[PDB]
């Protein structure tokens with residue numbers, strides 16, 4: 001049995017890594033957290049530090065405010081009974097206002113005001129967290145890729161909960177807060193729109209979603225195969241290709257007749273992934289605003 | 303026809319079968335025994351599909367479809383025009399896939415690398431063989447498998463799914479979808495991390511793995527650079543494992559409406575009968 | 583109609599993107615070559631991208647790619663056939679010559695440096711205060727080669743400081759000198775470390791290093807190359 005580098009055989013620890021200063025305001029970093037020998041068989045053992053700071057707190061508090069707004073409604077739905085709460089946990093739902101209130105903020109708590117409130121806390125939690133991904137990069141001198149990519153996820157989420165409802169004319173179009181209820185919403189959306197399998201954008205989304213599983217299986221597996229030549233140290237291999245980058249590229253060139261670079265691969269990655277939610281969001285945004293029935297649309301190919 | 307660094311690697315050796323017989327390239331492509339096997343299987347397979355296309359009366363790629371034996375053939379053979387061609391194309395497809403992984407193994411040996419890629423590929427092959435071989439055999443008929451056609455395969459997805467109501471409620475399907483989504487998230491982020499290090503702000507120098515910092519700053523953890531490649535691998539393979547679990551069990555150990563499976567939790571004696579809430 | 587416009591545009595944008603990605607990935611190993619080193623006639627439909635310049639930190643310069651591609655080392659291989667596309671037979675000892683699965687690249691003959699400009703990889707003995715934190719400690723274990731003979735013993739672990747992980751086992755040979763063996767190519771068992779890539783007699787042949795408390799990218803590549811090449815080239819003496 002040859003060693004496969006899925007798990008480490010020996011962990012080593014030294015001083016808590018406090019990381020790079022650059023332009024970070026160190027006043028705002030916690031200190032380290034514990035060290036998890038468990039995590040350490042697979043990845044890094046060190047937890048923390050994290051970086052708090054103004055926007056962080058806004059986000060974190062605001063996010064709890066959302067989580068708690070939903071949970072209150074759930075207890076309420078359980079008539080305050082613990083054993084019921086636990087029982088019906090995946091069945092509770094914080095539903096948006098009825099079609100009748102339109103886009104008004106004037107619906108009763110018990111039928112929408114609470115949804116809108118919870119949605120308000122979510123909106124600030126996500127955007128402040130976005131801005132966080134940008135600023136943590138800024139302070140470190142780093143590129144803005146993570147914030148751009150996060151924008152791609154944000155797009156789908158904005159379309160589902162906010163852009164589409166507005167265009168459509170009402171908050172009733174939006175997604176409820178529930179484990180089971182959200183899946184029902186999902187099913188019903190497709191049903192009511194002629195089956196999303198007829199939306200060229202849904203189908204693109206799938207190709208990317210699958211593609212990401214394929215790409216990362218491939219990438220991950222490759223780096224692991226060429227890790228006995230230091231493959232995982234991708235940035236130095238970018239600055240100074242080693243036999244790792246080379247055997248990596250040549251495996252694929254000999255297999256399928258073309259190949260990546262140790263930096264290019266990462267551009268394949270970022271795009272495979274971002275394109276999932278990119279197409280996805282267009283696909284949804286179009287639905288009902290412009291196309292009522294993807295089967296019907298599909299019949300006139302236009 | 304060669305990458306600037308390629309020649310030092312194009313040495314003899316590593317083949318699994320044939321010694322030096324098929325040890326050679328054609329353009330960038332390595333051949334090998336299993337490159338030959340692959341060609342023979344993929345070529346036959348395509349020829350049989352084009353034939354099945356003639357028997358069906360179309361050349362449109364949006365229409366061409368090869369359906370399996372209808373349900374009343376069980377697990378025997380069917381006349382070529384009535385699911386026999388599918389049966390032979392499926393033998394071809396499997397031949398082509400396995401050959402391709404074994405050709406991958408052969409490349410690995412020439413290049414002195416690890417076998418991780420063909421290992422990873424084997425999970426996809428297993429997903430495929432679950433849908434077209436394992437599930438049908440356990441269910442008693444080839445006609446349970448999906449047909450080979452761009453849109454007709456999608457019909458099979460929907461009709462199989464709705465046989466159990468909203469397929470969302472398949473518990474394995476949920477775990478699987480979780481891996482898919484998570485894996486996409488890890489792809490987005492690994493890609494963006496590395497790129498933001500290699501491509502820093504205008505004029506600044508290339509950053510370093512110390513990256514760990516950015517992520518710790520952001521969420522209080524960083525898995526590391528060996529770690530993330532281990533992750534993507536695990537995430538995406540796990541999505542496909544659960545994908546295959548979620549279908550190996552459907553139509554076999556569970557065949558009613560997936561939503562109803564969840565009743566075992568609600569119906570637990572300690573709370574089954576307490577009133578209030580959605581199921582009280 | 584608006585959905586038709588959108589899907590047609592997307593396919594356009596996506597062709598653009600495949601172009602952009604394909605060319606981006608052409609920044610190394612291009613232009614293509616013939617087996618003799620000269621510019622192959624057919625390069626395919628993708629042109630090389632405009633160059634780009636990476637600023638290397640710690641005054642190590644820049645890299646600019648695409649740029650002139652050379653091996654910067656002899657390649658002890660020769661043709662085995664009169665036409666394109668065959669294997670190139672090793673002209674000497676492939677292990678020693680660094681060809682095939684023994685290949686190394688000629689990277690910079692300095693050590694990769696951490697984000698603070700310090701050497702990324704130290705022997706543990708010289709990294710304060712790093713210690714084995716879990717799993718069997720290999721230091722002290724005999725090292726066994728694929729001929730099932732003892733080839734030496736583990737005298738330290740070279741560790742990656744910024745990422746806190748094991749990268750090599752420093753191994754002492756019959757004659758008192760050490761070698762680096764990659765972490766990824768050894769099996770730490772409980773009474774031994776097992777090295778399947780090499781038979782015992784092939785250990786002296788591992789590339790040495792010049793200062794005993796650091797390793798250079800060049801040296802790393804030669805060690806890793808040499809050890810991997812063992813799987814193909816040691817197969818005569820193995821055995822398990």
Ligand code: BCL
Nearest residue numbers: 157160175179182183186470475476477479480481483484
């Ligand atoms: C894509 C089209 C549909 C969709 C349909 C699907 C389908 C189908 C499935 C899910 C499932 C997931 N969906 Mg959904 N769902 C979408 C909308 C989203 C949104 C959102 C837009 O904000 C959220 C938060 C979720 C979150 C949920 C999770 C419970 C689950 C796993 C997510 C994941 O793997 O993330 C990536 C993982 C992370 C590391 C980040 C997220 C962490 C998760 C676990 C926490 C978020 C929810 C949390 C509040 C639940 C805990 C409450 C209780 C105390 C247990 N969905 C839209 C509307 N979703 C799956 C499931 O198994 O549900 C039962 C499932 O089968």
Ligand code: BCL
Nearest residue numbers: 202203204206207208210211214430433448452453455459
């Ligand atoms: C996995 C679960 C279901 C199913 C779920 C669905 C759903 C749902 C969708 C698809 C869609 C796709 N499916 Mg399907 N799919 C099935 C399994 C298959 C199998 C197989 C097992 O052999 C194949 C080849 C395909 C391939 C196809 C593609 C036509 C399309 C996009 C794939 C993709 O981006 O992958 C990701 C991988 C890559 C990016 C690699 C690219 C490889 C692709 C492009 C090769 C396609 C070859 C195709 C023309 C077949 C011709 C064979 C040749 C003659 C040899 N599916 C099973 C039965 N599939 C989507 C679609 O829009 O179709 C209309 C879609 O919405």
Ligand code: BCL
Nearest residue numbers: 153156157186187189190196197202205206209280283284
């Ligand atoms: C039966 C139901 C319908 C269905 C209709 C739906 C609907 C409706 C939708 C999809 C969507 C998609 N469908 Mg579909 N789908 C069909 C069945 C298929 C099948 C199949 C048959 O095999 C597959 C593979 C898919 C594939 C998928 C995905 C490719 C795609 C969403 C991608 C995504 O990453 O979302 C997950 C990502 C997000 C939702 C964004 C995450 C947003 C961020 C901001 C999250 C914040 C989290 C935070 C607030 C919570 C913190 C928790 C933490 C623990 C801290 N569908 C059938 C036909 N599908 C979506 C789509 O894009 O369609 C075009 C969508 O709206």
Ligand code: BCL
Nearest residue numbers: 426427429430459460462463469470478479542545546549
């Ligand atoms: C209305 C329909 C139902 C439903 C129907 C079911 C059914 C039925 C199935 C799934 C399965 C899938 N569903 Mg569903 N499911 C739906 C809701 C969704 C939603 C959603 C957001 O709503 C999502 C995200 C998913 C996601 C999941 C995945 C877990 C799984 C598909 C991936 C896979 O198995 O690949 C695995 C990979 C493969 C099989 C591909 C293998 C490819 C290799 C081996 C060969 C290709 C080489 C060659 C042909 C290429 C050509 C050569 C060229 C040169 C390229 N489902 C709705 C509710 N779902 C499928 C599954 O789990 O299958 C196991 C499945 O059968």
Ligand SMILES: CC[C@H]1c2cc3[nH]c4c(c3C)C(=O)[C@H](C(=O)OC)c4c3nc(cc4[nH]c(cc(n2)[C@@H]1C)c(C(C)=O)c4C)[C@@H](C)[C@@H]3CCC(=O)OC/C=C(\C)CCC[C@H](C)CCC[C@H](C)CCCC(C)C
Nearest residue numbers: 063064067125126129149150153273274277483486487490
């Ligand atoms: C490209 C498409 C893929 C994608 C990518 C993506 N997502 C993004 C980004 C990227 C590029 C990241 O920058 C960002 C991120 O920060 O990740 C680390 C993120 C992110 N994607 C996330 C979720 C997510 N994204 C989705 C996935 C996807 N995003 C797609 C598959 C999914 C799915 C599939 O639904 C999930 C649910 C988060 C991990 C993060 C967004 C962070 C955020 O907006 O949160 C702000 C608000 C909170 C912190 C709310 C907390 C509520 C908790 C339930 C409470 C419990 C924990 C608590 C915080 C502990 C505190 C304890 C105290 C008492 C002290």
Ligand SMILES: CC[C@H]1c2cc3[nH]c4c(c3C)C(=O)[C@H](C(=O)OC)c4c3nc(cc4[nH]c(cc(n2)[C@@H]1C)c(C(C)=O)c4C)[C@@H](C)[C@@H]3CCC(=O)OC/C=C(\C)CCC[C@H](C)CCC[C@H](C)CCCC(C)C
Nearest residue numbers: 210213214217344347395398402422423425426450451452
């Ligand atoms: C295991 C996790 C994921 C994964 C990983 C994976 N895929 C793999 C491998 C791995 C590691 C690669 O090494 C390998 C590769 O060569 O990389 C490009 C590959 C590969 N995965 C591929 C496709 C693929 N992977 C899939 C996805 C996945 N692969 C999972 C998500 C799917 C999805 C998601 O739908 C598809 C479409 C190819 C790009 C490649 C395999 C190429 C190959 O085996 O070629 C040999 C044979 C041929 C060239 C064609 C044979 C033709 C047949 C004889 C006839 C066709 C029959 C077929 C059944 C008809 C289908 C019709 C459809 C409309 C349904």
Ligand SMILES: COC(C)(C)C/C=C/C(C)=C/C=C/C(C)=C/C=C/C(C)=C/C=C\C=C(C)\C=C\C=C(/C)CC/C=C(\C)CCC=C(C)C
Nearest residue numbers: 070071072119120123157158160161162175177178179182
């Ligand atoms: C144990 O008990 C306690 C109470 C302590 C804690 C437990 C609480 C529990 C159990 C809560 C569980 C929460 C759940 C299940 C939430 C998960 C729901 C899901 C699956 C969410 C998925 C869909 C979300 C989407 C797509 C919504 C997007 C929202 C937006 C885009 C923002 C909307 C913006 C609006 C409407 C505000 C408008 C106002 C202005 C002007 C900005």
Ligand SMILES: COC1=C(OC)C(=O)C(C/C=C(/C)CCC=C(C)C)=C(C)C1=O
Nearest residue numbers: 487488491492495517523524525526530
């Ligand atoms: C850029 O790649 C990424 C890493 O960043 C370096 C991560 O590490 C993780 C997060 C890993 C896990 C399993 C967290 C569990 C550990 C804790 C905090 C208890 C993800 C998803 C990721 O995509």
Ligand SMILES: CCCCCCCCCCCC[N+](C)(C)[O-]
Nearest residue numbers: 030031032033047048521522523
């Ligand atoms: C999304 C991954 C979740 C990562 C959470 C890890 C948090 C680490 C907390 C560090 C702070 C601990 N403390 C109190 C000792 O400072």
Ligand SMILES: CCCCCCCCCCCC[N+](C)(C)[O-]
Nearest residue numbers: 007008009038039041042043717
């Ligand atoms: C996502 C992180 C989860 C980490 C859990 C991994 C535990 C695996 C332990 C592997 C066993 C190590 N051992 C003893 C063989 O050396």
Ligand SMILES: CCCCCCCCCCCC[N+](C)(C)[O-]
Nearest residue numbers: 199200201203204207211271272
């Ligand atoms: C990062 C680029 C990789 C390319 C992935 C594109 C695959 C094409 C799949 C066809 C989708 C067909 N349709 C009708 C749903 O649009």
Ligand SMILES: CCCCCCCCCCCC[N+](C)(C)[O-]
Nearest residue numbers: 256257258259329330331626627
């Ligand atoms: C989305 C599938 C597209 C099918 C085309 C196959 C792409 C493989 C790359 C071709 C390699 C070019 N080469 C070396 C033969 O000239």
Ligand SMILES: CCCCCCCCCCCC[N+](C)(C)[O-]
Nearest residue numbers: 257258259600604625626627628
């Ligand atoms: C979605 C993936 C797209 C596959 C085809 C993209 C590149 C095809 C191969 C390029 C040709 C390789 N070449 C000639 C530069 O060596």
Ligand SMILES: CCCCCCCCCCCC[N+](C)(C)[O-]
Nearest residue numbers: 351363364366367368450451452
């Ligand atoms: C069994 C599935 C049918 C195979 C179809 C042949 C592959 C062609 C790819 C789809 C593109 C359609 N086209 C050429 C009309 O644009």
Ligand SMILES: CCCCCCCCCCCC[N+](C)(C)[O-]
Nearest residue numbers: 476477478480481484533537540
């Ligand atoms: C963020 C990386 C950690 C993986 C989280 C994936 C969420 C889905 C939960 C599936 C876990 C079930 N499992 C495999 C332990 O049985």
Ligand SMILES: [Fe+3]
Nearest residue numbers: 219223234492
């Ligand atoms: Fe990588």
